[PDB]
Structure 1
Amino acid sequence: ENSVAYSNNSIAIPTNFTISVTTEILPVSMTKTSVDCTMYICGDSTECSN
């Protein structure tokens, strides 16, 4: 808790400065993939293939 003062005719002014650095990270893409239905759904049975 840090309450700021208030008055009719009072202001505040800085007299010095400094420089800082900051980092940010963003995803851009995912890993592609591919599938062939026949191999996965049916191993070798010819009747299954028909």
Structure 2
Amino acid sequence: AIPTNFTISVTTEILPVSMTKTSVDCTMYICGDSTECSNLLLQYGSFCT
């Protein structure tokens, strides 16, 4: 079976390339503006880094 005519077709492909960049202030999230909580949290600085 041999084709006798043709068709020219255009199709689309969608690909993700990047995502949102985020940063966290560890003390702001855990303690807010409490000085006492920050003095207590000074024992966990390595984990936030």
TM over 0.5, shorter chain: yes
| Aligned residue pairs, count | 39
Structure ID, larger Rg: 1
TM-score in terms of structure 2 length: 0.69
Which one has a larger percent helix, Structure 1 or Structure 2?
A: 2
Of structures 1 and 2, the one scoring higher in RCO (CA 8 A, sep 6+) is 2
TM-score in terms of structure 1 length: 0.67
Identity, % of aligned positions: 100
User: What's the Cα RMSD here?
Assistant: 1.0
Structure 2 unaligned residues grouped into runs of 5+: 40-49
Structure 1 unaligned residues grouped into runs of 5+: 1-11
What is the deviation of 1:14?
1.0
1:40 aligns with 2:29: yes
